[PDB]
Amino acid sequence: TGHPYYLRSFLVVLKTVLENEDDMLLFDEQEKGIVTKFYQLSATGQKLYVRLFQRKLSWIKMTKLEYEEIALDLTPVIEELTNAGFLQTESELQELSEVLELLSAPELKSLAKTFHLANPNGQKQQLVDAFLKLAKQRSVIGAVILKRAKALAGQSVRICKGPRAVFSRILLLFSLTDSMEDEDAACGGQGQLSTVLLVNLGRMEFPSYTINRKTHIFQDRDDLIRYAAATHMLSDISSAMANGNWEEAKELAQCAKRDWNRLKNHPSLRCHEDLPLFLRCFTVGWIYTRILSRFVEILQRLHMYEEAVRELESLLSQRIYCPDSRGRWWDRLALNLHQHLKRLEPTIKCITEGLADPEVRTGHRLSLYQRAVRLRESPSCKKFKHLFQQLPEMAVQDVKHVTITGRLCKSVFVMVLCSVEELALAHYRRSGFDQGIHGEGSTFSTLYGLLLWDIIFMDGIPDVFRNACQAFPLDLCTDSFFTSRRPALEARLQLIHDAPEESLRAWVAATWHEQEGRVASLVSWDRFTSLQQAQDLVSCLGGPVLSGVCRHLAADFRHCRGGLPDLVVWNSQSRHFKLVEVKGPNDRLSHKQMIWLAELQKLGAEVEVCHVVAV
Template sequence: MISNPLEDPFYYLKNFQHVLDWIAARYDDVLSVDEQCFITGFAQLPVASQALWVRMVMRKGEHFRASKLNYPEIGEPSRAATALLALGWLDDQAPLGLAEVFELLQKPEILARFSAHITRPKARKSDWLEELAGVFPQQQSLGQWHPGLGEALYSLNHRALCDRLRLMFFGNLGQSWSDLVLADLGLFSYERVEFSPESRALRCRADIEGYLHLYACREQFELSGDAEAVLQQVLDYEVDNRWLQRRRARLLFQLGQHLERAGALDRALQLYQHSQHPDARQRSIRVLERQEHYQAALSLAQVAQQGPVNDAEHQHLLRIIPRLRRKLGLAALAVVKSTAPDRLDLCLPRDDASSVEQQVVAHLHTGQAPVHYVENTLINGLFGLLCWPAIFAPLPGAFFHPYQVGPADLHEDDFYHQRTELFERCLAQLDDGRYRATIGETYAAKKGLQSPFVAWNHLPPGLLAEALECLPAAHLKLWFRRLLLDIRANRTGMPDLIQLYPEQKTYRMIEVKGPGDRLQDNQLRWLAFCQAHQMPVTVCYVQWQEPAQ
């Protein structure tokens, strides 16, 4: 927290200035002339003008009516806007199309201005717009559209520049300036990590432009649904930054999926072959199968079988290789049938006010054997608490601003290998019993801080204490090591419920399936893992009781 919002009405301004200082100190060698001029010019503005600019840039949209810029600490918006207009950072005569005018005006204001052309006064705004669009094709200022309004409209001219600064600070465009405000208001709190002056998300100007290029391609694709319009731009983009390589691979994979669904199989296959996405090889095999190129599909599957990318690919290969062999007329391979997990069938009265999982909790829960609806939160939470020092270790490239939920390389292939010694030090505590005290101390010291693993609202102290008594350290270690093998894939799919038996110091996990529901692939992988290590796990199938006649 840079400034206390309860004591300083300009807290958001001081935070924004802190961001600019941070960027100037770390990105001085890559800032464009426009960005340097903005940072210098901002510092020279009157405080009210600075505050108005920050208020506007933190809001969505480009156009703002003066009446919507009512902030007591700023005062009259027209005075605060004067210096911004002089610099060209704001425009009070921006040309607007009719659709933009309709977004800015209320229904009575629209009716007052266009009543002569509106045939259905009680219709919706969208109906009026459709009716008038052909009559008013021009673009002009709001004052020209509605001379009687008597109110200024201020339009931001540097949104793209501020987005670039936001990218440099956060390392992504997914986080917004409002994250600073939420932290100041105490809604979000973050772990303090040491930063070096060299800490930054993007190494050079080419990285910044590359990120923006991929972001623009993705936005264009999502808005238009036309993969071909951006496909070549993404294919032609080459980069040696691993983080940007991963973003490019993900976008190529998404474009490939879109083309595959559209039946453009040759084009989809080309994209999958260029993508380094972990699922790209699976999809390539599937496309070859759909094209009836069975031998090519089988050959690629057999290559994959020698070194599956992850458990999901291994699971996929176990299904598709026998099918491809059948289509090629080859002999069937011996299949090792896995043992089905314990099964529990329940017939419960239907209660639409609660989920099926909650109804099973209510049915099975007793004082001696409490049941908790934890899904993925318990094991992830215990892992996050024990391994907190390794997760938040200030390694180069992991942290570069104070508002990170977790390390930037959390889903990189080498996340564990970069921290092997740190993680092994944490996991070693499971061998000598120290883990209980460590988890409890971390819970007390870090409660409420943002974490990629700990969902505090789902891990109350009572559940934590019971879990540490009932879950064997050996099982915790196996779960944690599986998490570290593939964090993105293995942090989900865990059983919904856990039943604890404090007197016996044991437990059982329960996956709940309602009528018509079936086990998902990631759930099947977790169930198989638990069975392979003799962990007590049950699949509960629920049917609803027939209502009484």
């Protein structure tokens, strides 16, 4: 059915969301109408529309429209879309600000020239503010401007906002089940599909699992609209931060903070609050909380720490939203109090509560403890005996470090140019480990996914699979993912722990063969260079090691997926292996990194920090 990828991927999105009664409740007749209208277009019409949907939202010169793969002459196609009410022509081009925007710098010249009142030179931005002030006061001459501006611009089209808004809202619904497609893409700006989805959705093959919904996420179409608002807000803030527009970003955040304070009482929330965590993250309240968290990053960037500390205390005062984020919060609270506000009394309480919170883990739990030792073992603190108070003396077991060198040129070395980690590999190759992978945490991740695939994608857990295109159970990064599969996991873990170096070889082979290619977030099909490499490796690691790593990734992927060693190296014959974090001249171990190395050692694995010093 020869459809081009962008259209195929678009169509997968509409289908996947429309086949949900739950989700279709969230659209009015008028809205659904527009969807049908899409389906009523020719393929040519639809191809163009997707293209235009994927461009930036604003007018386009007819000259800057070319898709010979769509049509050698597009006027009919445009006409179609225009009758359909999907696109608008220069004829509806009425705003002036807009017409000027569409005109180039040299075209703003020819208009600043054929209009004596204008100063004929300046930046594109300059001439615009000008042309707008003149049309504002003496209104009649501003119409003659618009006329020639329009004639100068040429024939132009724009996507209609109303139809666009609908597809965007479908996209939003699609992208939730898919984390968010990307943490900015089907968030906003004015939302389209992620590059990865746009290009690949139409070709992707997803794991089989049984859809099974017993729970509404959104009350009504209103509720979704709210959620979509906040989403586009959170996107906007994020875009500011990313460009350096920190002040703008602040206005946005406060604007958002008050918006959220209006909704505080709204009935929809009582229900949201009631949803399981793996679903609650798809509500207004959660998005706003995420905004607030960005707010505190902006407050810190503008060195306004008393205020960051207020927002941080405020977040940490409620357990309904983002409980996983508490680690980051407590940690960040403590760092602000200790290092930016020098208030040590509150810095101690901070830490104390932080460590009592079962929702703080790994990295941020270690960081808080490590600040706690720094304090009660410091001259400028000896005025207290209130951190000698029962500290679970969490002594992360010490690890074998090592130092190699390389000639400096992300850090480039020479040997042909290479990375830091690639230079460490070459060391270990000549240290008798012929085999090695620079895979960081995905090496272990795909192994876990290989060994537990069928339990990952097990049936019998309501709401964790809500539609066709998932690549993980929605509860995957949650405390509950283990809880809800306890008996199966427990048994699978036990079983791997005891499996000889050939049952594992065969388990992996079984999944690889049944699942190869299937999109699943844990697994990277090219992470190993062939099935037999994965086999070679699982053989070296053996049962208890493998079993332990999987145990953590399943108990707490949310807080464990990060910090595994850059490298796994092994001797083909001796079957001996080492887990190696490569640290360049300019870095030391993150907290997560050290917790892991401790943990790997407890499972009886050779672990090693390899430092590189330049020459």
